[PDB]
Symmetry: D2
């Protein structure tokens, strides 16, 4: 039902469904089986940063993930989003845990989209930036186990009182306002997203990951999408 | 019921309710009877621009209106918005006509709000800019007679096929996402709004005006607020 | 001597040096002989808009040129600017006339460059926007025949009192501050430029064109670069 | 000679020249004897943040300084900068030490100035943001003992190898490009500056302070302005 385009930070290798045998970043177009992936040297307990960029002229979705003092990981995929997504969409973050677990903490999130028309100086834009989340964040649609306010952070999946991450959890956060990514008179459409995250697990095998995604405006968590499905897909096809 | 703070571009002098005897700009705090006004040399048929600014440190709401090749008009009022408005609000534009009429056309509208916390680099922001409006503008809540899409403009009040403005009309447009204007750890909160408009009337006496306003999130047009009430107030108290 | 990367809006076809036989837009890397070009339906006397974009992840320089009510023209070229340009550069606009002529008027110009480091939230940026130019524009380095202030515009090449464009003219405008386009710890570097122009000629054959360019910081107009050389190259190799 | 407007973070009370008997923030208009001050609970060794704002409509220069987990300090002063400063100015940071000392480390610095003209959509802007400084920062004019690059920070005054601050030191950093703060057709001019700093001293009595300042473009450090004069004034009048 839902149309999903996402950049996944996959912490657990499910080789039975196409994941490489190591943590990786990937670009998912309507399927959890990434169209392209790159090895990611994930660091348990460290704050990392992900940057996602795209523009309608080049038609290439690219993402870069890094941690301080370390080399980055990058992945790119040629795709025309006009042919995949509706004209109006919502953007958000999703995460899940299953048998294995980890905290999926978001410390900041910014997004900027621009539509440049052929009229002189005619440019439409939307920009939001969160460097702190409140208990009652009215401009976010929280789904599943996601909550905001703990230490000013956004916890996508369940975490107990003692800070311990729970398994079989799924949660998403979408920006309240729909986003216009295509318009008939637009000559250039582009967006850039950045978010900082903290994945921590008491185990040697963290799971399952975090994903930045773009979807139809009325998207909701598919049934049974905990674990390897990242709260984004109904199955592994 | 609704809590309204607005900057009015009042084209018709209703001296019976406190308006000066000439077109004027004014600052309205919960009442159509402006707390402060300034003479405005309105130009029928010309595109004008209004700028509104405010910050929590100075606690002064100021507005400047101008037309190309002409001197500007300015008005300021000392007011602490924390004591007038809720923590979360919606921002919008409103206009009305009555026995007398005019077109209340909006050609562009931008808004920027910022909340700077005491945490290092911790800043929250929201910014939107419309230089063109579509027939289906999903990020705007249109109320009353307001419509978008005609020539790429936002028509706040009714205009016939031949471009002729109708009387007894009222319409408003609010940005979809609520806006956070106060937070317990914020050291500075501020906003700036800019919109360009075209007020045109076939008559020597245009009415009634356009207003930029901030209100509780669930604000709706009060009954009988056409004409002198600008689609904002239930009465003239 | 100078290192030049430029996007040319070439109004005169010099087929003897590789130009296609029609006005065109092209990407020039250290040579006036464009690495790639696209047909451009230039409109004499109309205000057009050019958009240029690039990022270090995709390594693709793309440009889009359009006029109101018309289809756009686009050109892209895969090039790693890190391998062509120095770490610090200046950005500017250049234009020329020769035997044939045209006005090379710039009405607005904006530029944004960003360097995102691997440190958390660590981002460096520079942004400038001119929608009007003054007689004494201290933040611009004017070279050759370029002047600012006439009607608030930037005239890159000589125009007489009666508004008539002169031949054999060359002029450039560079932003005063050097721009940092590469840094050892940067994970993503990108820039976007936009400018609106008005090319008008009394003749059926306008020449020679306008170009947005990036160069070493101490770049100056090469001798004899009027005409087909666009004020950028010392010869046609 | 120089014309100086500055916001001082004064760490040492020189009661003989008008300082209150405690660390304080103040607004200086052409004299080190602040026109207005406010008590500042300075924290040795902690990273603080200063915000400075001003607009031509309200004509009020305000500043807010804070540290994480602490209440802020604010100071405001009504002053028309058009009557004090030239049309073109440079903005910068200055610091000094004398008999007593402290490190005057700047970790980030951002600035935004806007000039809104009466022409439709006509707005000029300049914005820069440094979250990291390089050894060779070509867009900064360093004066005196100021250096960049150590740990990616800007050290305004001398610090030895072991990180120990030196006395009798003075240094300033100005942004390379001049800034336009007034224009004949501007209806609103405004600026906002933010910088984070780390003042650390091995002594119970740190000195002398840091100041954000605006000056004529060719401003240089006055002779003998170490110590209480903050590298800004030639004497204490
Ligand atoms: Ca997986
Ligand atoms: Ca009235
Ligand atoms: Ca040519
Ligand atoms: Ca002192
Ligand atoms: Mn995967
Ligand atoms: Mn009134
Ligand atoms: Mn050519
Ligand atoms: Mn003092």
């Amino acid at each position: 039902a839902d149309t999903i385009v996402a950049v996944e930070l996959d912490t657990y290798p499910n080789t039975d469904i196409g994941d490489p045998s190591y943590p990786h970043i990937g670009i998912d177009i309507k399927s959890v089986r990434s169209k392209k992936t790159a090895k990611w040297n994930m660091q348990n307990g460290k704050v990392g940063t992900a940057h996602i960029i795209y523009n309608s002229v080049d038609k290439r979705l690219s993402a870069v993930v890094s941690y301080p003092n370390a080399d980055s990981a990058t992945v790119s995929y040629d795709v025309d989003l006009d042919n995949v997504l509706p004209e109006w969409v919502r953007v958000g973050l999703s995460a899940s845990t299953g048998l294995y677990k980890e905290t999926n903490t978001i410390l900041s999130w910014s997004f900027t989209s621009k539509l440049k028309s052929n009229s002189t100086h005619e440019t439409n834009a939307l920009h939001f930036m969160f460097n702190q989340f409140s208990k009652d964040q009215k401009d976010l649609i929280l789904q599943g186990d996601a909550t905001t306010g703990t230490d000013g952070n956004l916890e996508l999946t369940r975490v107990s009182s003692n800070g311990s991450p729970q398994g079989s959890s799924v949660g998403r956060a979408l920006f309240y306002a729909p986003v216009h990514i295509w318009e008939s008179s637009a000559v250039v459409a582009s967006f850039e997203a950045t978010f900082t995250f903290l994945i921590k697990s008491p185990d040697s095998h963290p799971a399952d990951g975090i994903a930045f995604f773009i979807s139809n405006i009325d998207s909701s968590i598919p049934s049974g999408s905990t674990g390897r499905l990242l709260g984004l897909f109904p199955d592994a096809n």
